[PDB]
């Protein structure tokens, strides 16, 4: 039994960074693939184990997912997520969402409770809404590291 | 974009992916992460991929489901598969990235050509590995 | 390797006992007159990317046929439309999702992949990038068929009144 | 669901799908069609591939993409690959429909595994082959 996780890939500079700032990095990834180890320790599936350790990445400022979402040329939040279980092969999707706290969350209940792979925009979250998801403003997601790395990548 | 993989102690795979996607992105464009077999596949028989990368490369490649097939018909093992996929087949489509992957034999490979990917593993009853940079 | 052409116009429940020969020869006479304007830009020498453009925004066009014009119903009596379309020389794609306001999904879908860093748009957001690049804007209404109307009716119970 | 494959005299391949979806659909609901490796894919080392069908399971099948990675990878003719997705993977998945695909050597498939799909293909200069029913 394992677990990987991912919190994306890139462009970090060595330079660009205190020994302090990285381990803000390695402290949250630790105590997630911690919290998924233990899940899979006890017996719980590789399905809530990835929902779960994506979701806390989700929570996490750190990633660029959920809340500290990079903003968009608008200035804006955009977020997109996927889950597939290889026990079903069933998988689900949302692209495109603003206003769900937890989008792998939102992936989970299409999967589950969807027709469909993939839903998108409103009409995602209308589903997600119509079976208990609670609506966010997409402020939440802003942090004031992404907001500074988009005029960065402007400027 | 996050990811996680897993292999439980039934022998089930599974993935997940999520985003953000892109500073500064045109809005209503979608990358890898949401499109089954780009940015996220998981099959019992095979393996469960989470990417992070270039999101019109990783579709245009269907990274995650090509480390699948490199597997199941080409016969490449996963490290060869993700060699193959992460450092050749997505830079050569103007592509950059990593992903996440692990085998229904409990291999797990964390490839990446770019300066770092905020990257974390470990077997149940066992002490994870962390990493940022390369190696 | 000759050069060669293949069309769909859709796969499923297809009985013979559901049609006349004159009803078939509707489908035949369409189907040949889109796959005969493909084999002759081929034979003309033209890509292989603009002949499956061209075939398909002619299938999107026959009402006979579930893309673009004679597009199915959705739960509330419109048209979302989906296309994506493929080079297999630059391995470059495009794609649009959940369009109802172009009249040419896989026209749209060419614009994203000749005319963007992307593979796929979603929405207004999709229908904005056309538009913004002299694609016609056009109400969902000119793809509304009697005959998928019909099929709609069939589908379901209709509301109290 | 519409689709066109083509291989031209220069020997490049491409593919290309449109669709209104399913009648009574859910609005902002996504099937294979626009998605690269489920309801579209070409590669000029491989296959072109346009899908009509059960959207949901066209995904997760990654129906379009499977054609190339068996005949890229695992050595399958068209012919045994488009039998082995249409015949066997789909419906083991509860999948119905068809694709129609043409290989780099101008090998042509036009599958299913429904009652009828709509379908015509024809070399250039020659005489086209229209179908509505099975064979
Ligand atoms: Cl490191
Ligand atoms: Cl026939
Ligand atoms: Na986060
Ligand atoms: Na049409």
Known sequence: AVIAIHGGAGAISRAQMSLQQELRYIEALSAIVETGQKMLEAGESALDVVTEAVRLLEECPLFNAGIGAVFTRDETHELDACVMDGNTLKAGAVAGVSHLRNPVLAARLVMEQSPHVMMIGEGAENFAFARGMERVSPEIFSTSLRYEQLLAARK | ?135
């Open chain 2, 1 to 135: 974009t996050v990811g996680a993989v897993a292999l439980d102690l039934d022998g089930n795979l599974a993935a997940a992916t999520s985003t953000g996607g892109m500073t500064n992105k045109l809005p209503s464009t979608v990358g890898s992460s949401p499109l089954v077999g780009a940015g996220c596949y998981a099959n019992n028989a095979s393996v469960a991929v989470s990417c992070t990368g270039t999101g019109e490369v990783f579709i245009r490649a269907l990274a995650a489901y090509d480390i699948a097939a490199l597997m199941d018909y080409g016969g490449l093992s996963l490290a060869e598969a993700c060699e193959r996929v992460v450092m050749e087949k997505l830079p050569a489509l103007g592509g950059s990235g990593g992903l996440i992957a692990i085998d229904h034999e409990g291999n797990v490979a964390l490839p990446f050509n770019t300066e770092g990917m905020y990257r974390a593993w470990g077997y149940a009853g066992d002490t994870p590995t962390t990493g940022i940079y390369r190696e």
